[PDB]
From Swiss-Prot, chains A, B:
It comes from the Viruses. Keywords: Early protein, Host-virus interaction, Inhibition of host NF-kappa-B by virus. The keyword Lipid biosynthesis does not apply. Changing residue 28 to E: Disrupts self-association. GO terms for molecular function: molecular sequestering activity. Homodimers. Interacts with host IKBKB; this interaction inhibits host NF-kappa-B activation. This is Protein OPG200. GO terms for biological process: symbiont-mediated suppression of host NF-kappaB cascade. The lineage of its organism: Viruses, Varidnaviria, Bamfordvirae, Nucleocytoviricota, Pokkesviricetes. GO terms for cellular component: cytoplasm.
């Protein structure tokens, strides 16, 4: 028995209202639930590919995740805004942010439980994204 | 191997910067981790007593948790703002909100895995509380 995201099996999202819950549960699921429960949907295929958009924006995300202050959400957001400064973000920048946070969540997670740091990855993303960003990234999720 | 909140054993908080991280992990821990990790600190004793402040403000929190739309964070916040309308909240109202969300998280959680609803309880609280609220409730956590 392991956390099962609502959209785990989904190939697409219907409403744009599902966008925040979806990204949230994705990042939480990347903590540890991923190695016990898989998600074959086309939706989770797309999400995982955001790692590519992350690498494109942050260059080396492995070395970046290790460095960043995951104990401090506010400061992490400040660091991200070095790479993505504007409040108006592009669809690639938004994917990068989700991509980075999901990687951080996997890096910092335990095998069967989450950690303070892996949870904080979830809140860094929330800090970063506004409602206008959710409309845009929605276009990659159908 | 269960989630272990950073402040699980703590009797107090040192910095006001720990306040958001603490409440967050408390609410997550109320999902299911509470049955496998005991938190004897005076801090968690105080937090759990916020159920009293919840009952005081929302009358019957059991019947209220069942009714509310936990699938919809925005709407849950709207419902709460019926009871606590002002942006300037009192220390009792802030405790009520934490109290209610922790109860909701326990109600909706599974036995070994959180649920979409139990997680949403966490986000309802985040929706409700601003930084000025964290300074106030900090006075109950030392």
């Amino acid at each position: 028995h392991v956390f099962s995201p609502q959209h785990c099996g989904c190939d697409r999202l219907t409403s744009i209202d599902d966008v925040r819950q979806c990204l949230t549960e994705y990042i939480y699921w990347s903590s540890y639930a991923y190695r016990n429960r898989q998600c074959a949907g086309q939706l989770y295929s797309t999400l995982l590919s955001f790692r590519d958009d992350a690498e494109l924006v942050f260059i080396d995300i492995r070395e970046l995740v290790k460095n960043m202050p995951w104990d401090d959400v506010k400061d992490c957001a400040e660091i991200i805004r070095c790479y993505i400064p504007d409040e108006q973000k592009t669809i690639r920048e938004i994917s990068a942010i989700i991509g980075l946070c999901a990687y951080a969540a996997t890096y910092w997670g335990g095998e069967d439980h989450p950690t303070s740091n892996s949870l904080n990855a979830l809140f860094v993303m929330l800090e970063m994204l506004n409602y206008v960003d959710y409309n845009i990234i929605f276009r990659r999720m159908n």
